[PDB]
């Protein structure tokens, strides 16, 4: 198309050939996937190309798209599920004809000579603006001046005939035999074709969501990158040189691609075929899509389909175990989890049975999307819940309609068993993480399931196991709470920056030499005000030169030992870290625990100011052993201010003291007669005197921040004081 681009359109017997060849290539992929009909094959697989897809077919065929296929579906916070609705290009339009290139190249090289001839008299440095403007123009392009080789390339004179003679030197046929593109700087640009190809799909939201990505469901696209296909596709398969046997294997490299597309490719729309179920699993597999079966066997490996079903049921039970009173449930019963209930698809039994002593009215049968119900249609009290798991395909991730249809079928099918007529069915699509409920609701139930189910989805670690196995099979990796701290739970902050520390002093060389020093681990609970402070003198620093990596392990090991020894009743529910690389050594030690969760704080924390607490640490440095010291950071503050203000105050005062620390020596004594008493950590100031220094410190933080920000007042006073009270890293206007 680059060489022939003027001629090819008139050559239309060649256009018939190009349609034939493009169709042949597609047929070869269809055969490799094993198929004998178009119907399971939407175009989208090929054209989705590098960015998402992994293939990347450029087209010259008038492939009329299925576009009635182009519908994508999303779940709202209400549990209601919303639907969204929308010819792929020939290159020929994008590839500029040679007439255009020859006229455009004459004028662009002419105007460069004028601009350079101007620039030679003007001796002024040549503009960046024109060089960014003219980039794709000239037969020797203008970017050829950028080429970096060009000081040598000036001496390469044979090169166009020489590239033709390479056909005698080298056994591989070269399509670009005519263009040494470092001289020809590059006579085409695909980027408009790729971007329009996404538009012709409606790609970015629509096609991503469509395939497997809803199974990964984590955020949008922007974080996500594809790793190398590490696994059996590469390392031994290359090493052994078996190639007679590798011809027998030859589907296996397709495995990464086939898994991602398989929600499309598996889809039941064969024109002709029959449906088979993968054992111990609810997946229906249509034809022998070659690699997919082992890929799914490796994802599901062990019972996990059953294990997901029982875990969400018992998490539902645990909600009802708490919501006994507000629902008038005298007990919640867990029915027998028959070991095939979760993947027998013809029938179901209730899983959770609720008991009551109440007079009660219940809705006719209704969806989570119905925000109010005919809740007086009937009076009854006995309730069942039933949970159905699903693995959707692009023809059907229907879960609103599937929840409706399966509820009606199983309640009416005599093969089913149910304890009462008043029931909800819960449906979850493991291929898409969509959920739906269809139910005879009593009034309280619908908002509870709505709230619980959303929180359940993330929490329910059996889904985490499934997702992480999908991510690993995909090799696809991503680059990436303020009310919770007060709210109720046992939550800790932890530090590692003060643990391993080194001091610098100059040798008689006049260059700098290092000496290492004792360091502290800072652990803090914001709701109780309680601080634990573990000192590391001897044990780590004597032992190794690894000490930084060992110090991370020892930080996680010492905090693990603290949690393990001190309670079983009041072990932290959450631990919060800014150092988030610190999450990973904690996580392995939490594997002894399971019951504890770690979060990455998303907000900046005092711990650099704890280096100023290291001044009080110097009183610790006087101690000779790796002792532990216990503190509460709240004095008289502990009663009155402690929940609401004192976290905000301590965050503000502690962060402020770091950039202020000499100035804080003055400000801590707002009047010279004021004092800090030995039984307190903070100055003896009342309410209003604490407010005066608090407001001064807050404004002084904003004043120093204002010195960069100096356009500060109008936006940053309203928005950024909130965000600085949170502690966001606010650097946004250039980053936006």
């Amino acid at each position: 198309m680059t060489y022939f681009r003027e001629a090819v359109v008139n050559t239309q017997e060649l256009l018939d050939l190009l349609v034939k060849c493009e169709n042949k290539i597609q047929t070869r992929i269809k055969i490799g996937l094993n198929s004998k009909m178009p119907s399971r094959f939407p175009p989208v697989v090929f054209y989705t190309p590098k960015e998402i897809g992994g293939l990347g077919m450029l087209s010259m065929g008038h492939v009329l798209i299925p576009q009635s296929d182009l519908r994508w579906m999303q779940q709202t916070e209400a549990g209601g599920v919303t639907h969204f609705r929308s010819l792929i290009p020939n290159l020929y339009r994008y590839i500029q004809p040679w007439e255009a290139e020859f006229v455009d190249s004459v004028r662009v090289w002419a105007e460069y000579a004028l601009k350079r001839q101007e620039a030679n008299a003007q001796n002024r440095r040549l503009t960046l603006e024109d060089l960014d403007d003219s980039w794709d123009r000239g037969i020797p392009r203008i970017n050829t001046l950028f080429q970096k080789d060009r000081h040598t390339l000036a001496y390469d004179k044979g090169w166009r005939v020489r590239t033709e003679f390479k056909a005698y030197q080298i056994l591989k046929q070269n399509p670009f035999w005519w263009t040494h593109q470092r001289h020809d700087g590059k006579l085409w640009n695909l980027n408009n074709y790729r971007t329009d190809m996404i538009q012709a799909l409606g790609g970015v939201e629509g096609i991503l969501e469509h395939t497997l990505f809803r199974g990964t469901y984590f955020p949008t696209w922007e974080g996500l990158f594809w790793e190398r296909a590490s696994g059996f596709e590469e390392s031994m398969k290359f090493k052994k040189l078996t190639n007679a046997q590798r011809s027998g294997l030859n589907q296996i490299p397709n495995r990464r691609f086939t898994l991602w597309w398989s929600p499309t490719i598996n889809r039941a729309n064969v024109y002709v075929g029959f449906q088979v179920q993968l054992d111990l699993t609810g997946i229906f597999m249509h034809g022998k899509i070659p690699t997919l079966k082992i890929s799914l066997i490796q994802i599901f490996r062990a019972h996990l389909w059953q294990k997901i079903h029982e875990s969400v049921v018992m998490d539902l039970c645990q909600v009802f175990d708490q919501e006994l009173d507000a629902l008038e449930i005298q007990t919640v019963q867990k029915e027998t989890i028959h070991p095939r209930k979760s993947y027998k698809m013809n029938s179901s039994c209730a899983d959770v049975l609720l008991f009551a002593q109440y007079k009660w009215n219940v809705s006719r049968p209704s969806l989570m999307a119905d925000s109010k119900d005919v809740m007086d249609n009937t009076t009854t009290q006995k309730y069942w819940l039933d949970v159905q798991l699903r693995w959707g395909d692009y023809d059907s991730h229907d879960v609103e309609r599937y929840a409706r249809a399966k509820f009606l079928d199983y309640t009416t099918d005599n093969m089913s068993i149910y304890p009462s007529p008043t029931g909800v069915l819960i449906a979850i699509d493991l291929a898409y993480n969509l959920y739906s409920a269809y139910g005879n609701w009593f009034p309280g139930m619908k908002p509870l399931i709505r709230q619980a189910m959303a929180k359940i989805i993330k929490a329910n670690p059996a889904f985490y196991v499934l997702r992480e196995r999908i991510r690993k099979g995909l090799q696809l990796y991503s680059s990436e709470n303020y009310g919770e701290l007060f709210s109720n739970q046992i939550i800790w902050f932890v530090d590692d920056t003060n643990v391993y520390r080194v001091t610098i002093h100059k040798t008689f060389e006049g260059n700098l030499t290092t000496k290492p020093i004792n360091g502290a681990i800072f652990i803090f609970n914001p709701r109780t005000g309680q601080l634990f402070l573990k000192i590391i003198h001897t044990s780590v620093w004597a032992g190794q030169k690894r000490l930084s990596q060992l110090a991370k392990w020892k930080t996680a090991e010492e905090v693990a030992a603290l949690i393990r020894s001190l309670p079983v009743e009041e072990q932290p529910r959450q631990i919060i870290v800014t150092r988030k690389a610190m999450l990973d050594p904690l996580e392995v030690h939490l594997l002894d625990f399971p019951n504890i969760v770690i979060k990455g704080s998303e907000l900046m924390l005092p711990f650099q100011a704890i280096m100023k607490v290291e001044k009080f640490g110097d009183l610790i440095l006087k101690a000779t052993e790796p002792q532990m010291v216990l503190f509460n950071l709240y004095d008289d503050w502990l009663k009155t201010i402690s929940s609401y203000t004192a976290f905000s105050r301590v965050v503000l005062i502690m962060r402020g003291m770091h950039i202020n620390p000499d100035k804080t020596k003055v400000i801590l004594k707002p009047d010279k007669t004021t004092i800090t008493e030995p039984h307190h950590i903070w100055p003896t100031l009342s309410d209003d005197d604490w407010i005066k220094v608090e407001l001064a410190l807050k404004d002084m933080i904003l004043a120093d921040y204002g010195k960069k920000n100096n356009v500060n007042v109008a936006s940053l006073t309203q928005s950024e004081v909130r965000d600085i009270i949170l502690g966001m890293e606010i650097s946004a206007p250039s980053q936006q």
Binding site: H151, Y155, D156, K157, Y168, Q169, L171
Partner: protein, 97 residues
């Protein structure tokens, strides 16, 4: 000019293997000679000049055909230590010509 002509020669030879990637012995001997020719570059020119003056009789050429279904093409693999001399000479002849 010679040091710059040698760069153009060596980078032409290396370009074929950057595409081809798989190296038996002879591609390993050639890439060793090309990488050597960079750190040698004044020495490598001295060999190339000495080769062009003295040697006059050469190691055997291998021949292979390239299968385009309407017509074969004949492909020759000259010995690597000579190819750098031929490759410098090709660049030099065309530059002076």
């Amino acid at each position: 000019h010679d040091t710059k002509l040698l760069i153009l020669a060596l980078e032409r030879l290396k370009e074929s293997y950057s595409v081809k990637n798989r190296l038996n012995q002879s591609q390993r001997e050639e890439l060793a000679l090309i990488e050597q020719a960079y750190d040698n570059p004044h020495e490598a020119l001295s060999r190339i000049k000495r080769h062009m003056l003295t040697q006059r009789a050469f190691k055997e050429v291998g021949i292979e055909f390239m299968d385009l279904y309407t017509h074969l093409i004949p492909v020759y693999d000259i010995e690597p230590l000579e190819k750098v001399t031929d490759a410098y000479l090709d660049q030099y002849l065309w530059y002076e010509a």
